């Protein structure tokens, strides 16, 4: 009902702004000021002194199996849907859902209905249409119709290249899909991009290199993920940043890194190479199936773990925080997200000085307060 | 994006609350209080003393051809899409769009894309899927899929019964459509109703009477409109209020009333009969094709329906002694209740900041949609992309 | 891969057979004997003295939302898939999955793929095609194709009648669906029936009465469930048992009973009225959305709770056990299930004297042993 | 029923294990032991002394027209469905059915329904979806859906390349089909491979060579059959074994060999060249149309050529386990049938008892005798 006032917030917007008073109401950031705002008590829901603790935008996890992934090694490996608290307790206030390898038994209707479920439970959610294989799995007859007509659908993903599980897509198929995503993006104001799953194939980003050389499509339309899964792929991804693509680094748990880089190592290496960090995002692959050589699934907890690892190695908080917030909102054309700015959505984290999460606000409501869950999923 | 404070508002919520201070921010009503709120000037965009002038919710016009209607007497009669200001200048802050007789050349994609256009221009908009004829015109393969998956699609309409332009729908077809709308409504929290176009056919509401007698579908699922177009239909509509249906009265211009009641006469008559007015709504049929006649009855000119008839209706019934809150509810809270729009139709904390400021004669002075002024001292501050 | 021998089992098959030795191997019941079998130690995996404890068939829960149900009051009410142990720990060794009210966002491919997941994890699973609404939700173009070509698909359900959430199906639509299920059943040897969701509509079982009066379709094809949800419906369901239909009673938790009967009350009342109990089954509606006036979901735990309630009120164990085992296997044409008989699947419960479950065997493997889970779902912790 | 005990079995599993007692029950192999098991008579259905006769796994014939093939030279050449005994009497306890050249009048529904018919009659049966031509003949809208949702459907076949009767498939079409079979295989635990019909076209295995060089698809996904039909094709198939493909040799009758190798000659030649025999399978093309020569008379392929091949190569000095593996364990390994192709505890009780000359004396399928002392105990519903 009322206003929420956050006093002495050490604001990372994600760029450091210093101490501010932050006023929240109607699910929005209404003011960011040096002034010690004096308000009538009758209209204030919560008056909180953060006493110089860090305030950041909520994380945007743009690669999550919100329905659960798996199904790649038997039907029993179908992962259950990710409960609300497995996003919010880890600082994820916006998720972008996708289908992966199983786009056969799982449908775009499964995915979009779970987006609406997470929205009803008080977080923000979008999704990718099309999935992994060709022809694309869509709700309507085509990806272009899905993106034009369904507000939460922002692009095509995660479409597999250079992977034994791909549909062995041809150049002509890839640039047609990209053209449909791009046109739908222009018509709607949404991301109009193709989120590509990369495997360990030695062709790496060859299809995207050819698209950038031969077509007029803007480079931002080609968005490869898991680029840290092997070192030659990561090198090729870093080189292609100069052509204007955005690259997505996956926060693998330490077990699953194999012959590649952790998200932490990859981001530190991109910084050391002088890569444009504003073109680099990190995602968790939450709900993705995680085999042990027992069976588990990916968690959004690796995003904060990554942030702690790189900051402990001397990276500035704002550099890694941007890869989880403003950079994702910029690529995905989410102007209300990824920023502490007046008029933006009140999706906010309060961090301790070691960057542990103390509080999580989504759309102006506390989900986590003093490390305790206040709001949880319907069935948690 | 500061706060807006409206001081000394005579609040019709739509029920009269007396004088209040109303605080708006983030597109929402943040407070309604007796307190003379003192706020820091640095966070206040607008501090307005209404000095006891009436504040109401914005009107919800649940029957409008947002794409334009017509096409019923030649292709030249296709009405252009209704510009933003032809809603907002008349106090309409939420519209529900539909296709009418022409659901052949016009598509659900035309309709839904215009909903998104009106939302981008700063008003609120929803639509009906299915249209007028059988089989239904939908975006996906079925009405149930449209209502489940497309947030702005709230139900089926305007589906024609008792009209020479209908598809002569059978009872079994009607209750199947109603079942699909109802189930989709339960799944989504949306209206989940069938908005029925009534014509002058003497069968009147017989298909709805049969549905209420023979099925378990709740009465609110069957929502007839234009019930004032002839007197026997209006009498049957009033009688069926006791079974729990909502009825929609159309604010025809005075020319187009023919052998029926104006919206004003129909609402006054429902009140005189002791009908439950909370089950009665008024809509404009804006963007509907409006033929103009000479003294000889020859078709001379063509115009389209306007949302201006809603306020004209409110002025007419209040001049005849109806309480402002009774007619205002028929444009606001009753529509929001039937259509399950909990953010709309009410001056209540947490609701959308869709507000009208009225003069003493109930002329609109100011119109706010989602916390932004569209009309201020009778001047347009915000207009459609292509308005001049 | 040895033999398992269960000595001194007090066998309810589900009919009481007395004390027996039961031999299990290759997932099957190989012998039921008075003999104290002496076997070479080298081929015996497990030699267990049950010391006179009750041995029953595993329960067949023929009405479960294995994918999760809900979605009837907002997308947030989509129930997660039921984990393996939420069947096996409650004595359910065979489940028949279905879609309910949400047969729009959920597909037959969702349902059938979860059947295969539960089979991979070591229980037995089947499903109903078609769902709740008309037209039917199927994997192939028609229910008849689904039942003919997909081994686990046994019939059509749960198809809604006398309910505000139904598709307001017409008699002609219902008997066409029934004819397709019946023909597919004859071609395949499978159930070939229509499992009908009943609501609180006052028309009750009128469409089924009309089908029995006007068509040649056998009565067993028309299988109404939730018949205990209101008392006039339950009375009509009991009267129609004399025409040869089977009725399914839902084991609602005590909160959700409203103006109807608990499964326990309904089964005791059917027995008191002299109804043919072999035509009565009980199911849990596991994974179904359960509102509090908070949100929870249905559990297979109500089946054993029902068995304890009716036995405490004087019903013979074999009467209620048949409603969970042999009666379901008979109606659904599952000849390997619902019975302790040689050649049948080794799906077995060991009960304490108060009928608490001590051990659960599915296809010859222990899932529960001395009330500890030995086998669990892929993602259970 | 209770337990069956087979005493003094000379076990080829298919590798030689020596003399064993084999215990069967519930359709499974429950024990393989040196112990002379003593069991209570009340639980024993059958106590059989094999007297040192050879015991092998049942043959897996992974290329059979279970519906009948033919239709390539007029409608009258449609072969009738193969009766149960025309598998079991020849030692075939598992068959994998397919459509061939006529995937126009014959459907995947014909094929899958005959799989279920053979299962009802007590043998094991699977099938290939898609058939010979492009676009594919499937039950559902796609091969990937067929393999994901229909338990008996294990892959795509028999898809024609280098043949005048092919659909002239392009590289891009072939690798798309292979990707769909592979992904469906991973999702289900099933074979997930493309079984390719090879003709006499001089392009031979060019499309598969290109797939192995240009894609990440595992080599095992590309499974060419009839590789013995001409000598240059057979040489190319043998060379590609080093890239990890499995190759299927067809047991043509002696008449039909033309300018190629018999299965026997092909397997002996692969052994002489030091090829990895575990990557080589033999299939009969049972139910395939067999014209007799001017075209004078018409017959159909029989599973009898599998055992004839085994007798031919063993008479030329090949070890029984080498050729037996090509009919049993190698097929079960490629097709991901862990219950088949092996005498191992927990496996299906699909067993052959052979005489000293390797003639079949007894055939057990899923623990039941189909053939006992060379007499049929079980036959098809309509066999007389
Ligand atoms: Zn991926
Ligand atoms: Zn992934
Ligand atoms: Zn109308
Ligand atoms: Zn109209
Ligand atoms: Zn149910
Ligand atoms: Zn139900
Ligand atoms: Zn062939
Ligand atoms: Zn061939």
Author numbering:
A (entry chain D): 2 to 294, 302 to 388
B (entry chain C): 2 to 389
C (entry chain E): 2 to 294, 302 to 389
D (entry chain F): 2 to 294, 299 to 389
Kindly provide excerpts from the paper associated with this entry.
First, cyanophycinase breaks down the backbone peptide bonds, releasing β-Asp-Arg dipeptides. Then, these dipeptides are broken down into free Asp and Arg by enzymes with isoaspartyl dipeptidase activity.
LmIadA has 44% sequence identity to E. coli IadA (EcIadA32). Like EcIadA, the purified enzyme forms octamers in solution. To confirm the structural basis for this lack of specificity, we solved the structure of the wild type enzyme at 1.8 Å resolution and compared it to that of EcIadA32. The crystal structure of LmIadA shows a homooctameric architecture as the asymmetric unit. Two Zn2+ ions are liganded by H64, H66, H198, H227 and E159, corresponding to EcIadA H68, H70, H201, H230 and carboxylated K162. Substrate binding residues in EcIadA such as E77, T106 and R23332, are also present at corresponding positions in LmIadA (E73, T102 and R230) and display similar conformations. The loop formed by LmIadA T251-Y262 is longer and bulkier than the corresponding one of EcIadA (S255-V261), and as a result could restrict access to the active site. However, the partially flexible region between G288-G306 (EcIadA G288-G303) is oriented away from the binding pocket. This leads to a similarly sized opening in the active site region surrounding the non-Asp portion of the substrate and explains the lack of specificity.
